[PDB]
Each structure stands twice: as C-alpha cells, then as structure tokens.
Design a protein around this nucleic acid. Structure first.
Ligand SMILES: Nc1ccn([C@@H]2O[C@H](COP(=O)(O)OP(=O)(O)OP(=O)(O)O)[C@@H](O)[C@H]2O)c(=O)n1
Ligand SMILES: *P(=O)(O)OC[C@@H]1C[C@@H](O)[C@H](n2ccc(=O)[nH]c2=O)O1
Ligand SMILES: [Mg+2]
Ligand SMILES: [Mg+2]
Ligand SMILES: [Zn+2]
Ligand SMILES: [Zn+2]
Lengths: 186, 73, 929, 188
RNA sequence: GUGAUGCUUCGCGUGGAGAAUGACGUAGCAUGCUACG
RNA sequence: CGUAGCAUGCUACGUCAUUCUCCACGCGAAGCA
C-alpha cells in the first residue's frame, strides 16, 4: 500500500523515530513520538484495509464478468466449434475408410443412407460427375469406404435405369447427372 | 492406439448430429444412438472403426446440413 | 430270493401295484430329504438322512415307471399299535394316504411293517426346501420335480441361467405350472385338519408328512382327545409354504368361474372395489385352521405386527382380483356448487380398503391446502384424460393426459478436448494401459423413459414367511434402538435444496421453493394433520438421469409430488437426522470418508470377530424388484419411533399415505399415467434409509435361514444348538415377542456377523469358522434368500469375498481400499476407479464445463477424489492425480493470461498455489478434523 | 453522523481545541480541552455505532418486507393457476357417462382406474411393432375394453400422419415406430 | 424436463466465542509539586 | 501526616478502529456416493 494520505504520515513519523531515538532527547519526546506514530499506524491500517476490500470487490466483480462473457462465447459458438473439433479429430484418426468417405463427400459423392456393415448390405451412393465415377468405379465393382461393392442399378437424376455400358467418357454428356448407384457389399 | 480417439470422436460426432437436429427422425436417431453406444462399449478397434464409418455416414448423407469442403480445408 | 420276493408280494397288499424295489431286498433304503423337525434334541427345516424306510416304485402296465411308491416303514410294536389306531380314525378322510399294517417274519420274530401306498417320490417339504434354498450349482430335486410333473422338459435346463428371473422370465411360467398342485395340497390340508378336528386328534402338521399329491401320512405324534376337540397345529406348515404360494401362483384357479382352469375368468363387476368378503372366503377356503385373526382391511389391525401379518394374506389374495379395482376410490363432491371428482379413499393390494375420515361434501370454498390436495390427486387428471393402451409395457396404463405421446431422448455428453489432449500428451490412454476410459454419457432414443419404467416387471407379488418375518422385523428394529424419532413441526424441517422439482402437476407453476414459501407453517401442519387422518394419492413423475456411467442403462428416478415430500419430511426427518448424526452404528449414512472416516468405519465393522472374513453384495435392480411386504416392513420400522406422538390410527394412516404415494401410486411417464406394480420410488423422502432397513432385513433373514437349515445334531457347540432350538421356537411356536431371545440373537449376530450398511451397499465382517460350519450366513445363504424373498437371482459377479482383512473390502460405495502408511500408523484410504475420475475430467454434461478455466473448482474436487491413488502401487493410478494437479496449474496460468489480455489488471492470486501441491489434498485424509 | 447533534458537538469542541492550540495554550489546561475532545470522540463513536447498527437492521427489515410481499404475490399466482387448471379439467370431462357410472355405484365410491375405461371418448394405443398392430388394432374399427373404437388417426414417433394402408408387413421397416393410434368410442 | 439423502471443496454474507495492535472515557493503587488550615 | 489542585510511571474494566485463527447458520457454484 502506497500513495495514501496516511502513508505519508506513516513515512514521516517512522523516519522521525530514528532521529528522535538517536537525538538523545527526553523520554517525553519518546512518548509523544510513540503516540503520534501509533495513531498514524492505526489510521493507515484502516485506510489500507478499506482499500484492500475495494480491490477485492473489484477483483470478484471482474472475475464474474469474465466468467459470464466466456460462458456466453462458449455457448453461442457451440455448433461451429463442435464441427471443427469433430473434423480435427477425424483427421487425427487417419483411418482409411473415414478418409475415403470424407474425400468422396468433399468431391460430392455422398451416400443416401447409413453405410451398412453386413454382407447383405444395400448402399445407395450419389455421383455428381463422370470423373468421380471412373475414379471410384470401374466395370461392375464399386470401391467405397475401403470395401468392395457389387453394383445393381444406376437411376440417374430423373429416375431411369442406366446400363453400365452406357456410362463412358464419350457417353457422359448424354447422361442426366447426378447418378445414384445402388450396390451390395462384397 | 486409436481406441480412445475413436470413442471421443464418436461422442463428438453424435453431439454434432444432435446439433443438426437429427432427433427429429426417430429411426435415424435410434440408429445413431445404437452406433454411438456400441462404439463406447467396444473392445475391438476394427469393429469400432466400422461402426464409426457407419455413424459418419449419417453426417455425410445430409448433403446440405453441413459444408464439408470448408470444414476440411 | 424267496424271502425278498415274498416281502415284495406282501407289500402289494391285494392292490395289484407291480412293484419294483429301490434297494437290495428287505434292506432299508437311505435317502437325503428335507424335514421340518422340532423335538427336545434338534429343531430346524434342514436336509437330514432317513434310513428307516423301504421304497418300492410302482410301474405302469407297459413297464414304464410311474411316480407311485410303496414306502414300507419298520417300527417298534408300540408305535405300530399307536399309528394303527390313529389311522383307523382317519381312514375315511380322502386326504390320507392309504396305509397297510402287517407283520413280517424277518429272521425269527414278527417285525411290524407299515406300508404307505402310492406315495410320491418327494414331499412338500422337498419342494419348499428346494425353492427356499436354491443353489444353481446343485439343484437336482427342483429339476426332478419340474420334469416329473411336466412343468418343463429335461432339456429346458440346458439353457444358461434357466433359473434367473431377469435373464429368463419364462422360468416364472415354468414355476406357475406347479401352482395347481400346490393349491390341491392346500385344499387337502384343510380336509385333513377337518378330519383331525372331527376325530379328536391333536398333532402338528409338517410339510414332510405330505406328498406332492396332497396325501398325508406318519401319525406318529398324534394323540387322542375328545372327538370334536382336535387341534391341528399348522404354523410351521403354512408359514414355510407361504413363499411358494406366490412363486408358483397357486391361487390362479380362483380367477376362473367354479375355480376351474378350463373355464374362463370370472367377470367381476367393473365398479366393485370391496372384496373383503371374497378375501374372507379365500382365507377360510385355504387357511381355515390358521389360528390368528385375519383382517382383510388393515385399518382394523391392532399393531404393526398384526398389520404385516394381515398384509401378507392381502398380498396373496389381491392376485385374484381385477387390477382395475385397486387405486384411489373417487367420489363426486360438490364445492361451491360445482361437481369435483376427488379421491375419498384407496384400495391397497396389501392394506385393503381405506376410507378418508374427513370427506367434506358440499364445500363452500377451497383454501390453498385443499386446492393443493385436489391438484395433487390423480382423480381429476385421470378422469379428464383420454384412455391409454400403451403396448410398449406390461404395467397397467390408466390414461393419456395429452393428445401426443412424449418421446424423451438422452443426449451424449460434451467432450473436453483440452483435458484429453493434455492427458494424452502426458502419456495417457495408450494401448495396453491399465487405465482406460470406461465411463461415458450414453445417449438414448425416444423409448428410454418407458423402457426403464418397464423394468418394474421384475416386481412380483411376493408372499413372505410371516412367522419368520415377524421375528426378523424385531431383530432388525434392534438395529434402530440407538436413534430418536417422532413427528416435528413445519418450522423444524430442513430442506437441503429448494430449487428442486415439486413433482407433477406442481412443476408447471414453480419449484419446491414456491410451495414452501406459499405454504405457511400453519398450512403445512394442517396438511400433515390431514395426512394423519386421510389418504392423499399423489402422482409420481419418472425423470431420466443424465449421469456418467460404465453401464449402458438409462436410470429413471421418481420425482414425488411436493405434497407427499412435505409431509414425509415432517414425519421422518427427526429419525433420519438422528441416523445421519450417529457414528459407529451398522448404518453408516452420514459418515464422511474424509479425515479418517473410512478407517473408522472399517475398524468399526471389523469389531472383534473371531475368524474375520469380509463379504459384500449388491442387489440387482434393487428398487424395481423390492417386494411390497419388505417396503411396508421398512416403513413400519421407521415409523415405530412414533410411540409417543402418534396413535395407532395416525400411524396406520401415515403408512397408508406412504403406500399410496411411493409404493403403488400413479406414475406419470411421458405425459401418460400408469400404475406402478410396486417397489421403492427412488426419490421419496426415505429412499436411502428404507433401503438400509431392507438390506439389514435381508441379512438377518439369511442368518436365520442359515442357522435353522443346519443339522442340529452336527453342531458341536451347545450354546449354538440351544440358540437354534430357541430360534425355531420363537419363529414357529411362540406367538408373542421374546425380548430376551431377540437380544440374544442380536448379540450373536453382532459378535459373528458385523455389518456396515449404506442403502443397498453392505460390507460384512463375519466369523469364517461359523460360516463354514453353517452357524452364520454365507454368500450362498444370501443368494438363497434373495431368490425366494426378492425374486432376483444374485450372481457371483455381483458379490465378493475377502479372506485377508488387511486388503479391506473389495468395494464399498464404488471405492476400493488401500492400507497405506500415513505418518506413524497404517490407515485405510478409499480410492476410486481411475477411469471414473478421467471420464469426469474428459466428459461433461454441459457445454460451459468443457472450458476448464471457468470450472477450476471442479478439477480441484476431482483431484481431492483422486488423491489416494498416489499411494497405489501402480504408477498409472498414481500418475492420474499428478495429471490433475498439472492441469489445475495450467488452468490457473491460462486464467491469469486471459484476465491480463481482456483487462489491464493483475490477479496475482497465488493463494491458489495450494491447489497444485499435494498438501492441500493430503490433509483431506488425515484424522486431524 | 453529521445529522446527529453529537457530531456537531464534537466538531465545535475540536474546532475550539484547534483554535486554542494555534493561538497558544496555557500549559496544563490544553490537556483538559484535549480531554473534552476525547470524551466527545468516545460518545460520538458510540452513538455512530448504534446509528449504523439500526440502519442495517432497518435495511434487513425492508428486505424482509420485500421478500414477504413477493411470496404473498406468488402465492396468489399459483392459487389462480391451480384453480384455472381444476376448472379446465372440470369442463374437460364428460359429465353424462361419469354421472351414470357414479350413480350405478352401490355407495358412491368407484375405482379411479375404471373412469377412463368406461367414460373416455378417445383412446390412444401405442404400438411398438407391427405384430402388436395386427394383434390389437387391425382394421378401421376394433374392440377394446368391451367397447368399439373407430380409428380416427395414426401417427408415428415423429408425429407424421400415417395412412392405414402404409402399415403393412413389408412396409413396417419404413415406419417410425411406435405408432400412436387415436380412436373414438363408437356410439358412446 | 431434470428426484431423495449423505459427504466434501470453493466463494460470499450475518452471527457467537476467542486472539493480536491501536485511540480513548470512568474508577482505583501509587511517585513528585503549589495553597489553606 | 490530612484536604483541594496540577504533573509522571504501572494496572483493571467499559466502549470503539483494524486484522486474523476456529465455529453456527444463510446464500451461490461445484464434485463424488
Ligand atoms: N442416483 C441414484 C442412484 C441410486 N440410488 C439408490 O440406490 C439404490 C441402488 O443403486 P444401484 O445399485 O446403483 O441401482 P440398481 O437399481 O441396483 O442397478 P444395478 O442393477 O446396477 O445394481 C437404488 O435403489 C436407488 O434408489 C438413488 O437413490 N439415486
Ligand atoms: P455408488 O456406488 O454410486 O452407491 C453407493 C450407495 C448406494 C446408493 O443407495 C447410494 N447413492 C448413490 C448414488 C447417488 O446418486 N445417490 C445415492 O443415494 O449410495
Ligand atoms: Mg444394485
Ligand atoms: Mg451399490
Ligand atoms: Zn390384522
Ligand atoms: Zn409421530
């Protein structure tokens, strides 16, 4: 505690104590200095205690406002924060199937239903282009989620069956994209 | 060795699905809950990862719900 | 073989019965059978070895053995004369097995022989013992009984856990097939008694003197009397048979017209609710010679012992009556001229019909108290609601209060990625690590609350051994003699949290604070006095719990109405606070585990047992499978502290309110009302203490069964032998309470069966020598008691035993024990599962809690919990606590940095430097304070 | 404090003492004027302590009055809400059938569990699977509780309207079970 | 829409007992000095 | 040696200003069972 009106009184009295004791003065002066110094000490203690209480109250209020602000920030941005966290964790996992399906989704090739796990498994996968088709499909086998599937039918944008032979680099402009390939797990 | 990462990731994934209002579909939410709880009660890493792929298929199926390209820079 | 074949022909006795011996010639056969014996030497219901009978099995006309035996008994001439005279009196009775008295020249003298003809292989004693001492390891009499009477097929036991009520509910059906046989036995018993009464024969009826066809034999201890003054004694018979009458559902035939299983069910009047005369007719039909008064309505009972006695019979008989007849009895009152429908009574399965004493018709106004009572009552809600046929459950559905069914899901927990990243950076969660994440927040779908409520199907009507229960209740109340109870005033009540739910329908206008502020102490005392004279049926709201666990289960708790909770507090809080303020007792509720409390509790339970072993158990689905009789007994034990403040009627009406509110009340589970079959409503004012009473009752019952089912001749200790004899006398031969023997048995249990009870958790330090000799209960006895008195099979994965007491109990309140050098002496410290603490750190139930900087006291509490792991000999468990300390330091640093960035201040708050040093947490387990 | 005249008396005494000291005190009586100052200080401090105590007690009493008024004002709110709910339920139950069954009662009391069974005009059946559907509420009309119910509506767990033709053995996997069937008591 | 009870940590407030420093009033023991008798 | 008045040292009680240990309760937050 410094820069208080009673702090200067304390400094002056305590500095004068050394002079009084070392000045060879009478003990009446000693009692006078004791009285003045102790009175200033008590007054400065009162002022310092009140100032400490004010600082403590300021600290508490500041902490509470910080907590409310942080809680509001944390709750408001829950959605985007959770999504970013999810994809950071997925990237850290570095699994073959997860990376495969995530890359296909980034390219626009997404499923229309939960990717089944059993052998008796019907999966419908959308395909928005011929390039992704040829990259992720060839012949009558469809590689997806680090697994092999056997195609059954492709039904184009407007529902209409398409034979596999009808999908090719020359034939791509004719077809009505996007396509929907339904396949069975290998 | 990628067995506590999968369970935490499944928790975060089901939280994200819940944020995307998937409980509005009783069947889809039931399947999501089944996958999540099975992954949590899993000892085999391969079973957990296949269930994780199935669970992530729910998020990836809804094309417009999330913007994958921005999320995965 | 001429002598043997001649003996075989003589046993036929004119009745061509195609006999084939069971032993070599005339040599007497030996079998190991259950006998309910009591004489000057031994007393008990145990398996003895009989070697004084020759069995000749009768075979069908096609050489197929049938269940008909000719048991030939060899006698002294005196008893041969005595039994012949009694039989000649009892010959005309159709419930008496045919006897043939003859004399056979064995070697050189005419030895007397008494042939009981066409007897079943097993007796009623064998069935009762097999079901009351069930051991999955060796249950061959039970299997043979089931197969022999076509209850099931011999391959039915190839299942795993075929005997488990939870894993294999179909076992109930298999047991129900026996019911009719048991019923016939009961009927025949009555006939036999009548014959005795008409023949002037005085004797004791025992289960082992009746076969599974209902026929009776023996007559060895029957004595002549005036022809019309016969006095059958049936206490042991009926009391030992009682637990089997509900397991086998014997009285199911009573639900059919003409009491015939072929004919259809009786079509009772739908508006009928008073079956008092039907209950009396059932009692006279079956328990005619049970010589203690039965009150169909327990409002007329003399004391709590009489109440339990008659409630047992009411439990048995209520299974015959339609479920729609039980519940609030709603009358039409007129208030201010408008017609209300208000519950003016209640039909209890156990207590019969109760009618409110203050039913004010033509009321002029409703005050706050009356308005609250009417709002609580399910009369208006059920009467004005739609009809519900919820097929998702078997519990009786009453009404749908809303036009849409509510499907409430459970959402997953929030992942604290900061703490998890920190942990993995500090070498956690690696493959092969002993510490791995096992506690999560499991999500649930819409059918979550209803699916968990459906677990009340494990609650079954359980008739108890009443003579045994009336002694067990006294011994259990001996455990609650160091406590002070009694009603208190509304101003003396302490409410821990007033920001909790007030129940239904009161949760749609405020919390409990609203109704504790709106209700004046005058109003609260008026409501209490009302509940002392009237029954208030309340609605219980089933609420899902959002908690972290290792088991994929959605716990549901009961939010009980504010009206019920207020009065229950005012009625029980004095006793509950006395219980929680007591140290060193059996019930250790209110005892802290910090500052040496764990060590004190363990040293107290150890006491001075001679050969100390530890054992412990958990009740599977404790609240869902608790019998109604045991819950009523627990409530009566708690209410017995009201001998100076409440009269008999006041205590009974408080019991009736407790039953109507937290035993079989109306349950609101998803906007619809259902009827709870029974069991505790976890969420009432006394859940933790009723559970403790129930646990102590089960333990005392296990000890009683262990001591009475022990061959008395094999007890080398005369004190224990006389104690067993007196125990049998006090159960099945004394009607009043023998306080001296109750104190003797309590002292015996305390000396050899020291207990430490906290709700459904228990730790027993027991004398292993006595347990091995069968003098005190072992874990097998506890399983046997639970099977027939709780309708739950207890597996060994739910129980544990510890030979070395320096290891402490294996688990208690989810805490493990470690004996660690703390200063100059070794102390027992509790430590949790490291996975539990790590899951608490990593997974939370609030988005704001995933930011650790705001929640630092949370991690301080977690570190306080995790401290005793530093003393563990495993370095991973020890590192768990240091992980929390380091993360607390990091959180404080981050908080200081954020406060410096957002503001232009300096926290310089290292009074918090004590939160990342071990002394703050080490001081929490030292006995200083 | 300042309002109290004791503070004024102390101020006058202190001003007099300060003026006497500045002008030059005699010798030993300046100690006596300081003594008067000290007496004033003690008495004024004692008065001010009671001043603060009474002020804070009055503040506590005002807070108590505010809380009591709020409690009495919320009691009225909850009373009115309970009365409104009770009146709504009164005007929500059919009086004809209820009166008939209550009059058929031998003494006046009836089981509560039969009131909806015999008087409810609308039934709600929750079907978990298709086998239960075919067993319980197949067709447009069905018999339950010794009464005939005409199916009014069917919805799924998502509250989507379901046509009775949609419910079929092959189409069951496509429905969001359980189904809620709302039916009306036919001809009362 | 989130129950009953137990224990524990933290923050805040009021209250009681007690410790320390200091101002200061009354009374009393007691040292020194002026005046009256 | 008594009385009045004035001054110095030591001690008891009473009331205040400040701090802190322990506690009884109240309120808020949290953790575990
Ligand atoms: N949040 C909780 C948890 C438990 N209990 C009480 O503790 C008893 C038993 O707890 P627990 O054994 O954990 O529940 P169970 O129903 O027995 O489940 P489990 O089969 O695992 O033993 C219950 O009867 C319940 O009333 C409670 O009141 N509140
Ligand atoms: P822990 O192993 O959770 O339970 C030990 C014991 C059993 C139970 O009755 C009681 N308990 C536990 C948890 C809870 O939330 N409430 C409660 O009463 O303590
Ligand atoms: Mg349990
Ligand atoms: Mg437990
Ligand atoms: Zn009775
Ligand atoms: Zn009482």
């Amino acid at each position: 505690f410094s820069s208080l009106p009673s702090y200067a009184a304390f400094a002056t009295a305590q500095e004068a104590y050394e002079q009084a004791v070392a000045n060879g003065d009478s003990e009446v002066v000693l009692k006078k200095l004791k009285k003045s110094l102790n009175v200033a000490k008590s007054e400065f203690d009162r002022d310092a205690a009140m100032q400490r209480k004010l600082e403590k109250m300021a600290d508490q209020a500041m902490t509470q406002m910080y907590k409310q602000a942080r809680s509001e920030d944390k709750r408001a941005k829950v959605t985007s924060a959770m999504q970013t966290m999810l994809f950071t964790m997925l990237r850290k996992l570095d699994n073959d199937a997860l990376n495969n399906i995530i890359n296909n989704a980034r390219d626009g090739c997404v499923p229309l239903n939960i990717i089944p796990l059993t052998t008796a498994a019907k999966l419908m996968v959308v395909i928005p282009d011929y390039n992704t088709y040829k990259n992720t499909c060839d012949g009558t086998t469809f590689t997806y989620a680090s697994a092999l599937w056997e195609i059954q039918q492709v039904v184009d944008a407007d529902s209409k069956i398409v034979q596999l032979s009808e999908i090719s680099m020359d034939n791509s402009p004719n077809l009505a994209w996007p396509l929907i390939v339904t396949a069975l797990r290998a | 060795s990628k067995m506590s990462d999968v369970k935490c990731t499944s928790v975060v994934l089901l939280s994200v699905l819940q944020q995307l209002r998937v409980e509005s579909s009783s069947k889809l939410w039931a399947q999501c809950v089944q996958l999540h709880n099975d992954i949590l009660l899993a000892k085999d890493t391969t079973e957990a990862f296949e269930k994780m792929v199935s669970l992530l298929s729910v998020l990836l199926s809804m094309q417009g719900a999330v913007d994958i390209n921005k999320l995965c820079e | 073989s001429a002598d043997a074949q001649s003996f075989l022909n003589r046993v036929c006795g004119v009745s061509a019965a195609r006999l084939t011996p069971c032993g070599t010639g005339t040599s007497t056969d030996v079998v190991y059978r259950a006998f309910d014996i009591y004489n000057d030497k031994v007393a008990g219901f145990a398996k003895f070895l009989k070697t004084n009978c020759c069995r000749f099995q009768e075979k069908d006309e096609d050489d197929n053995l049938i269940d008909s035996y000719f048991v030939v008994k060899r006698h002294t001439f005196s008893n041969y004369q005595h039994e012949e005279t009694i039989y000649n009196l009892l010959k005309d009775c159709p419930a008496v097995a045919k006897h043939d008295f003859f004399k056979f020249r064995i070697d050189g003298d005419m030895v007397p022989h008494i042939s009981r003809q066409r007897l079943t292989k097993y007796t009623m004693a064998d069935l009762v013992y097999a079901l009351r001492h069930f051991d999955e390891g060796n249950c061959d009499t039970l299997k043979e009984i089931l197969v022999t009477y076509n209850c099931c097929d011999d391959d039915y036991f190839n299942k795993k856990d075929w005997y488990d009520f939870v894993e294999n509910p179909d076992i109930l059906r298999v047991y129900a097939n026996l019911g009719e046989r048991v019923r016939q036995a009961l009927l025949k018993t009555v006939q036999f008694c009548d014959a005795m009464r008409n023949a002037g024969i005085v004797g004791v009826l025992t289960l082992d003197n009746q076969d599974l066809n209902g026929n009776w034999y023996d007559f060895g201890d029957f004595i002549q009397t005036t022809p019309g003054s016969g006095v059958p004694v049936v206490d042991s018979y009926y009391s030992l048979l009682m637990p089997i009458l509900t397991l086998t559902r014997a009285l199911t035939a009573e639900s059919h017209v003409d009491t015939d299983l072929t004919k259809p069910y009786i079509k009772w009047d739908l508006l009928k609710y008073d079956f008092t005369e039907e209950r009396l007719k059932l009692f006279d039909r079956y328990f005619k010679y049970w010589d203690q008064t039965y009150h169909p309505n327990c409002v007329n009972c003399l004391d709590d012992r009489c109440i339990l006695h008659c409630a047992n019979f009411n439990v048995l008989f209520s299974t015959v009556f339609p479920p729609t007849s039980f519940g609030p009895l709603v009358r039409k009152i007129f208030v201010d001229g408008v017609p209300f429908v208000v519950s003016t009574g209640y039909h209890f399965r156990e207590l019969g019909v109760v009618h409110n004493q203050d039913v004010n018709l033509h009321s002029s106004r409703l005050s706050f108290k009356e308005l609250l009572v009417y709002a609580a009552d399910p009369a208006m809600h059920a009467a004005s609601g739609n009809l519900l046929l919820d097929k998702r459950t078997t519990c009786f559905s009453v009404a749908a209060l809303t036009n849409n069914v509510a499907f409430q899901t459970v959402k997953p927990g929030n992942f604290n990625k900061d703490f998890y990243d920190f942990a993995v950076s500090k070498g956690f969660f690696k493959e092969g690590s002993s510490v791995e994440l096992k506690h999560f927040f499991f999500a649930q779908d819409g059918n979550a609350a209803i699916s968990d409520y459906d677990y009340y199907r494990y609650n079954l009507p359980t008739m108890c051994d009443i003579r045994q229960l009336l002694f067990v209740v006294e011994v259990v109340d001996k455990y609650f003699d160091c406590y002070d109870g009694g009603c208190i005033n509304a101003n003396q009540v302490i409410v821990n949290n007033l920001d909790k739910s007030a129940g239904f329908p009161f949760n749609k206008w405020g919390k409990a604070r609203l109704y504790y502020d709106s209700m004046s102490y005058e109003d609260q005392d008026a409501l209490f006095a009302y509940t002392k004279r009237n029954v208030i049926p309340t609605i219980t709201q089933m609420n899902l719990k959002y908690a972290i666990s290792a088991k994929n289960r959605a716990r549901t708790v009961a939010g009980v109405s504010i009206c019920s909770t207020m009065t229950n507090r005012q009625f029980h809080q004095k006793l509950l606070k006395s219980i929680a303020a007591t140290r060193g007792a059996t019930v250790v509720i209110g005892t802290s585990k910090f500052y040496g409390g764990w060590h004190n509790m363990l040293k107290t339970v150890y006491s001075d047992v001679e050969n100390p072993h530890l054992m412990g158990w958990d009740y599977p689905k404790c609240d869902r499978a608790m019998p109604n009789m045991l819950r009523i007994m627990a409530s009566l034990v708690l209410a017995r502290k009201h001998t100076t403040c409440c009269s008999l009627s006041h205590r009974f009406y408080r019991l009736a309110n407790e039953c109507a509110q937290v035993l079989s009340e109306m349950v609101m589970c998803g906007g619809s009302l259902y009827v709870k079959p029974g069991g505790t409503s976890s969420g009432d004012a006394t859940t933790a203490y009723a559970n403790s009473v129930f646990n102590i009752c089960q333990a005392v019952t296990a000890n009683v069964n262990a001591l009475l089912s022990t061959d008395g001749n094999k007890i080398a200790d005369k004190y224990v032998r006389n104690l067993q004899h007196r125990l049998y006398e006090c159960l099945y031969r004394n009607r009043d309470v023998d306080t001296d023997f109750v104190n003797e048995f309590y002292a015996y249990l305390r000396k050899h069966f020291s207990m430490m009870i906290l709700s459904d958790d228990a730790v027993v330090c027991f004398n292993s020598t006595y347990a091995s000799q069968g003098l005190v209960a072992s874990i097998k006895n506890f399983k046997s008691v639970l099977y027939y008195q709780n309708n739950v099979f207890m597996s060994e994965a739910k129980c544990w035993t510890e030979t070395d007491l320096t290891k402490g109990p294996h688990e208690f309140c989810s805490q493990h024990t470690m004996l660690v050098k703390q200063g100059d002496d070794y102390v027992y410290l509790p430590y949790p599962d490291p996975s539990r603490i790590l899951g608490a750190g990593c997974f939370v139930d609030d988005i704001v809690k995933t930011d650790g900087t705001l929640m630092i006291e949370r991690f301080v509490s977690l570190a306080i919990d995790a401290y005793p792991l530093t003393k563990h000999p495993n370095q991973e468990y020890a590192d768990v606590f240091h992980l929390y300390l380091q993360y607390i330091r990091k959180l404080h640093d981050e908080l200081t940095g954020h406060m410096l960035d957002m503001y232009s201040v300096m926290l310089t708050n290292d009074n918090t430097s004590r939160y990342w040093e071990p002394e703050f947490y080490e001081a929490m387990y030292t006995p200083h304070t």
